[PDB]
């Protein structure tokens, strides 16, 4: 108590970890769509196949995509499977039928692999030659500006 | 810090008492001239206190300022009070409190804060001699 | 809308106290009740800097007798105060004649230390005190190495110092 | 966790950022205030403070530490002390960045993860580069004027911040050589 309540109020912390997720909201089909289609399917007798997913919230996907594209690695949304970052499909947004989600994160993940590889190369320099070193220096010089813009949006 | 600033008051009471108790013709002309050059530094102390008052009324003096301000005359009063004790203890008159100042001037001479004082006191005390 | 609400690396100075309290209570439960260490708070920022400045006058806080990372920052300036006191104790005298002049020259530095204390800062930030008294505190340590508080005195000390 | 990080990186270790000699400064890695996106950032930021603690320890240890009471020149002597002496003024922008960060946080108590990362990513490549220059001097017991060579050959590299940083210390170390040469000739 008293720090736990303070947490529960002004902090969320339940959707990038294994906890139940809710968001206070006002459904009504245009943003309940995935659940609407699920209930239609369940009425249609599929037969069953539960859709147990943890429910991700909306704006925080946008935090994750800014973070992945800016240059830092290893997020909750967007995991690796062999060292190449791809969408995870274990999360569900209240709308989008869970298929548009896979596409939109797949294209953003296609950008994320590009920045993931370059940052991997640059991190493996600090753990003669003077050309690759001179090239990762230029790449990093572009990278700090590119990261600054996306961080500025993240604020 | 307050504890370190009180000893100059006893070292000021000792300097004012020498001018009364040792002003008799038994101790003589040299003791009169000696206490009358002890009086000038007390005048200078009061001259300090006036300007410090003008700064304190407008709140522009503090105890850290007062500590640095009264540290130079702390040594001055220390020398004059110790000299008053020594002249009283040996009942000195004549040349024995004209040798004592000569000795004090050599005693502290590495910084020459006290040397100018003892030199001035000997200059004033030796004219009737 | 109703505002997404910050997380536990964005909020501070209220959440810092809450989290420090949480970290502390977790630690005492995980120990057994033998890791007791009261107050996950105290003091403030500016009030703490004023207390740290007063420690150089000769006072101590409560962890010495002569937020919890404040102990590490505080030890660095507390150990400066404890050697400043052992310098003023050795400059109390006004053997040797050159040793007396040496003492009066030590007081020309202690006077700078006494002029800067309680005057110079309008209360800087907490980390600025550790950084500002790093290039200046090291010199105070050098004068702690210089003085004895055998240790030579007189012309032997003047020749050593030469 | 905000102020604690600045305290640990400045050289007064936090109770969250536990000082080790086998993993340096490191975040607790098990409490519910850390999560995978910021975890990588925290790992990145810890290394600069780990280097800073060794730097400050070594500078304090070999500058102004004896009155004239090793004989090794890679651990003692005027040139090594001159290296530490240059190093503190080279370390001044880390101080400048940390003090600057505290002002914006005191003005606004709710600012992003990326803000601390963004301010500290100019150090991210520069600190390990000047680290190996100290590491060589200690390892080979590099005595006297060979220190001048050791710093100089790696300030020919193709990185501008590393070049500037090593050049400052080399100027400071030329100081003591010129000071002895101004007498001997």
């Amino acid at each position: 108590p008293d720090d736990r309540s303070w947490l529960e109020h002004h902090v969320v912390h339940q959707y990038w970890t294994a906890r139940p997720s809710q968001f206070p909201h006002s459904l009504h089909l245009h943003s309940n769509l995935a659940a609407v289609w699920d209930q239609h399917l369940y009425s249609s007798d599929p037969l069953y196949v539960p859709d147990d997913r943890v429910l991700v919230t909306e704006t925080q996907v946008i935090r994750e995509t800014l973070w992945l594209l800016s240059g830092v690695k290893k997020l909750f949304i967007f995991q690796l499977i062999d060292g190449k970052v791809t969408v995870r499909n274990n999360i569900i947004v209240t709308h989008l039928t869970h298929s548009c989600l896979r596409s939109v994160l797949e294209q953003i993940a296609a950008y994320g692999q590009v920045v993931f590889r370059l940052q991997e190369f640059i991190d493996e320099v600090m753990g003669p030659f003077r050309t690759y070193q001179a090239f990762m220096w230029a790449l990093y010089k572009y990278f700090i500006s590119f990261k600054e813009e996306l961080a500025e949006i993240e604020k | 810090l307050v504890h370190r600033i009180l000893p100059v008051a006893a070292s000021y009471s000792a300097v004012t008492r020498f001018i009364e108790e040792k002003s008799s013709f038994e101790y003589g002309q040299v003791n009169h001239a000696l206490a009358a050059a002890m009086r000038t530094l007390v005048k200078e102390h009061l001259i300090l206190v006036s300007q410090l008052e003008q700064l304190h009324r407008q709140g522009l003096l503090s105890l850290q300022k007062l500590w640095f301000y009264i540290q130079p005359a702390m040594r001055t009063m220390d020398i004059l009070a110790s000299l008053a004790t020594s002249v009283d203890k040996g009942e000195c008159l004549g040349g024995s409190t004209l040798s004592l100042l000569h000795d004090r001037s050599f005693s502290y001479t590495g910084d020459s804060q006290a040397q100018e004082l003892c030199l001035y006191l000997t200059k004033a005390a030796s004219a009737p001699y | 809308g109703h505002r997404e609400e910050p997380y536990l690396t964005e909020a501070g100075r209220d959440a810092f106290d809450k989290f420090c309290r949480l970290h502390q209570g977790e630690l005492q439960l995980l120990a057994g009740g033998v890791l007791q260490a009261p107050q996950p708070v105290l003091v403030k920022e500016c009030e703490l800097v004023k207390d740290v400045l007063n420690v150089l006058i000769g006072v101590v806080s409560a962890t010495f007798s002569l937020p919890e990372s404040i102990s590490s920052l505080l030890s660095e300036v507390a150990e400066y105060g404890t050697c400043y006191t052992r310098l003023s104790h050795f400059s109390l005298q006004p053997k040797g004649l050159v040793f007396q002049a040496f003492t009066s020259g030590l007081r020309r530095y202690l006077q700078y230390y006494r002029a800067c204390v309680l005057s110079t800062p309008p209360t800087l930030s907490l980390l600025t005190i550790g950084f500002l008294f790093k290039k200046l505190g090291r010199q105070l340590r050098y004068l702690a190495e210089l003085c004895g508080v055998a240790f030579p005195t007189g012309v032997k000390l003047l020749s050593y110092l030469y | 966790m905000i102020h604690e990080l600045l305290l640990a990186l400045s050289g007064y270790p936090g109770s969250i950022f536990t000082w080790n000699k086998r993993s340096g400064l490191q975040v607790s890695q098990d409490f519910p205030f850390l999560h995978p996106s910021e975890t990588s950032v925290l790992n990145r930021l810890c290394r600069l403070g780990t280097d800073y603690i060794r730097f400050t320890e070594f500078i304090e240890q070999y500058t102004g530490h004896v009155q004239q009471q090793q004989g090794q020149g890679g651990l003692h002597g005027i040139y090594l002390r001159a290296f530490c002496t240059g190093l503190d003024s080279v370390l001044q922008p880390y101080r400048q960045a940390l003090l600057d960060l505290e002002q914006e946080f005191l003005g606004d108590p709710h600012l992003s993860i990326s803000h601390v990362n963004y301010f500290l990513d100019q150090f991210q490549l520069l600190f390990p580069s000047v680290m190996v220059v100290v590491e060589q001097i200690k390892s080979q017991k590099i005595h006297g004027c060979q220190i001048l060579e050791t710093v100089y050959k790696h300030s020919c590299g193709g990185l501008p911040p590393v070049r500037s940083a090593l050049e400052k210390i080399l100027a400071v170390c030329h100081g003591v050589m010129y000071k002895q040469l101004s007498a001997w000739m």
Side-chain angles (χ1 to χ4, degrees):
Chain A
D2 175 33
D3 40 19
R4 304 179 69 177
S5 46
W6 208 327
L7 175 147
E8 283 303 304
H9 301 320
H10 283 301
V11 181
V12 181
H13 289 197
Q14 60 203 68
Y15 53 102
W16 58 71
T17 165
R19 316 167 116 95
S21 319
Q22 307 294 326
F23 174 75
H25 62 272
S26 61
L27 287 167
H28 178 84
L29 164 153
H30 322 296
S31 190
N32 193 34
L33 186 159
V36 185
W37 188 248
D38 291 5
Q39 294 313 127
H40 150 73
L41 285 177
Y42 283 133
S43 50
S44 300
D45 187 77
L47 180 75
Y48 308 103
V49 182
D51 286 352
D52 189 7
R53 283 173 187 85
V54 70
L55 205 152
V56 74
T57 160
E58 170 71 19
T59 77
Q60 293 88 346
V61 176
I62 290 91
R63 304 206 65 167
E64 291 283 82
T65 173
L66 294 163
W67 283 325
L68 171 67
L69 297 173
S70 61
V72 291
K73 39 182 64 61
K74 295 299 289 183
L75 303 85
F76 174 81
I77 300 172
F78 309 116
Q79 51 189 16
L80 60 88
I81 61 170
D82 58 354
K84 166 168 183 303
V85 285
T86 74
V87 51
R88 78 184 296 157
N89 304 121
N90 319 105
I91 61 175
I92 191 164
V93 192
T94 52
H95 49 285
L96 298 190
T97 204
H98 187 30
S99 315
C100 272
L101 193 60
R102 167 170 165 84
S103 50
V104 65
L105 299 171
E106 190 169 282
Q107 261 83 24
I108 297 173
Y111 296 128
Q113 167 57 32
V114 171
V115 68
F116 188 30
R117 204 194 93 168
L118 304 166
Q119 289 281 115
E120 177 186 76
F121 168 65
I122 295 176
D123 180 41
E124 287 165 323
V125 177
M126 302 295 149
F129 192 88
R130 314 301 200 265
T131 321
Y132 287 169
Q133 320 320 307
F135 184 77
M136 61 79 69
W137 161 242
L139 196 48
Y140 200 65
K141 183 181 77 179
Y142 161 81
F143 274 169
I144 57 168
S145 43
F146 178 44
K147 177 183 282 184
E148 192 273 332
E149 319 314 306
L150 278 59
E152 174 170 10
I153 298 308
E154 186 76 88
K155 84 207 178 311
Chain B
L1 184 58
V2 176
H3 300 144
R4 319 175 202 177
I5 297 159
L6 193 46
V8 298
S11 199
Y12 197 94
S13 174
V15 80
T16 189
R17 278 175 303 211
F18 183 96
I19 301 174
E20 302 283 79
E21 310 303 303
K22 325 286 159 56
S23 71
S24 192
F25 285 102
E26 285 74 68
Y27 304 115
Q29 305 188 347
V30 284
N31 209 291
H32 302 139
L34 171 69
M38 219 184 265
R39 177 186 309 147
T40 52
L41 303 161
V42 187
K43 189 183 172 185
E44 196 173 356
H45 188 119
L46 293 146
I47 292 161
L48 198 59
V49 165
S50 311
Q51 316 169 94
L52 312 171
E53 175 267 309
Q54 328 295 347
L55 262 79
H56 174 262
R57 169 157 290 167
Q58 55 204 325
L60 309 183
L61 183 77
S62 159
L63 204 60
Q64 192 60 254
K65 302 200 206 313
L66 172 138
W67 170 235
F68 180 62
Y69 283 0
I70 200 46
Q71 268 283 86
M74 183 155 196
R75 189 165 179 174
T76 312
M77 279 298 98
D78 171 35
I79 303 301
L80 294 186
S82 156
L83 175 66
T85 59
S86 313
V87 171
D88 195 10
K89 200 166 173 178
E91 294 161 32
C92 320
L93 57 87
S96 44
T97 181
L98 207 46
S99 299
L100 197 51
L101 329 174
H102 192 87
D103 293 354
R104 286 311 286 286
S105 88
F106 283 142
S107 197
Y108 312 119
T109 189
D111 196 14
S112 315
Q113 294 301 287
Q115 161 156 262
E116 173 40 58
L117 180 146
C118 306
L119 173 63
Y120 173 59
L121 268 69
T122 315
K123 270 183 189 296
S126 76
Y129 197 108
Chain C
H2 62 284
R3 303 299 305 164
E4 286 168 63
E5 309 167 314
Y7 305 133
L8 294 187
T9 60
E10 309 179 319
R13 273 77 74 202
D14 306 358
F16 169 43
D17 304 359
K18 180 263 294 181
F19 178 65
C20 177
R21 174 172 52 85
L22 167 65
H23 180 267
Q24 181 171 358
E26 280 173 307
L27 279 198
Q28 282 96 47
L29 283 160
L30 283 182
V34 302
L35 189 60
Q36 304 284 349
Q39 298 317 113
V41 70
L42 304 188
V43 188
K44 192 55 76 64
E45 308 317 295
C46 161
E47 275 67 68
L48 180 51
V49 181
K50 279 191 292 189
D51 165 47
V52 162
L53 203 58
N54 294 357
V55 170
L56 306 180
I57 302 300
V59 309
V60 293
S61 65
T63 63
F64 319 105
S65 88
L66 185 61
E68 74 277 25
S69 187
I70 304 299
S71 69
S72 44
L73 177 134
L74 178 57
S75 43
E76 191 270 342
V77 54
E79 289 303 309
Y80 292 167
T82 59
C83 51
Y84 186 66
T85 294
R86 293 174 192 154
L87 286 165
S88 46
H89 177 265
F90 202 48
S91 314
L92 182 64
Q93 55 189 114
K95 324 273 201 163
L97 200 46
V98 299
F99 178 47
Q100 300 182 89
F102 164 84
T103 313
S104 315
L106 186 42
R107 284 183 297 216
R108 302 178 202 165
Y109 177 79
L110 310 181
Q111 272 167 57
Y112 301 158
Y113 204 90
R114 279 281 149 169
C116 74
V117 74
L118 303 191
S119 67
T120 296
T123 71
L124 298 168
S125 87
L126 194 72
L127 300 86
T128 310
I129 301 302
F131 280 150
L132 181 63
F133 293 152
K134 183 62 65 69
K135 309 199 51 56
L136 212 46
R138 173 162 54 240
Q139 187 172 95
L140 203 77
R141 298 171 66 252
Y142 199 79
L143 303 188
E145 293 169 61
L146 178 51
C147 274
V149 186
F151 176 61
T153 185
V155 171
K156 173 82 180 293
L157 180 52
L158 173 60
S159 46
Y160 190 48
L161 179 67
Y162 200 85
Chain D
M1 70 276 286
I2 302 299
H3 188 46
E4 284 283 285
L5 185 49
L6 301 179
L7 286 173
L9 298 185
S10 320
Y12 307 118
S15 282
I16 306 297
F17 309 99
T18 43
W19 180 238
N20 193 355
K21 301 304 200 303
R22 309 148 55 237
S23 44
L25 283 169
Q26 204 56 76
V27 60
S28 179
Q29 191 54 260
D30 48 4
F31 280 134
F33 84 110
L34 68 88
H35 299 300
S37 41
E38 64 191 0
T39 295
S40 63
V41 181
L42 285 151
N43 302 143
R44 276 173 62 144
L45 297 175
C46 280
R47 327 169 172 186
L48 321 164
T50 298
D51 295 7
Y52 200 72
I53 294 168
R54 312 290 184 110
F55 287 156
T56 47
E57 179 195 323
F58 152 80
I59 292 162
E60 281 284 326
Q61 173 178 51
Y62 293 129
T63 318
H65 66 119
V66 294
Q67 304 292 114
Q68 197 41 61
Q69 302 307 113
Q70 319 289 79
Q72 306 289 311
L75 309 165
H76 284 83
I78 190 71
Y79 281 81
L80 187 130
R81 171 183 300 204
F83 186 86
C84 305
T85 300
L87 190 48
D88 72 3
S89 47
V90 179
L91 286 174
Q92 182 62 254
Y94 199 74
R95 325 190 173 194
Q96 184 67 42
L98 262 54
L99 63 87
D100 186 18
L101 277 159
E102 181 48 58
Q103 173 52 50
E104 291 164 278
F105 268 121
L106 187 65
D108 199 315
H110 301 269
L111 292 174
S112 87
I113 299 94
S114 158
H115 182 236
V116 292
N117 182 34
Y118 168 60
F119 264 68
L120 262 51
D121 278 345
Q122 56 168 302
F123 307 120
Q124 190 64 234
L125 75 161
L126 165 62
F127 265 52
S129 58
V130 299
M131 181 66 194
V132 307
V133 184
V134 324
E135 198 60 64
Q136 289 169 70
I137 296 168
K138 289 179 297 172
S139 48
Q140 282 313 302
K141 306 292 206 317
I142 299 193
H143 175 102
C145 311
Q146 300 288 87
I147 300 170
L148 305 170
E149 296 184 24
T150 304
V151 57
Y152 176 72
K153 300 301 186 175
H154 315 120
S155 44
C156 90
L159 310 168
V162 188
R163 182 179 182 272
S164 45
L166 296 173
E167 177 169 341
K168 291 174 69 173
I169 303 174
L170 184 47
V172 174
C173 206
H174 289 138
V176 300
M177 184 273 292
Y178 280 146
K179 187 73 74 80
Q180 298 294 106
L181 192 62
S182 200
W184 182 83
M185 288 188 311

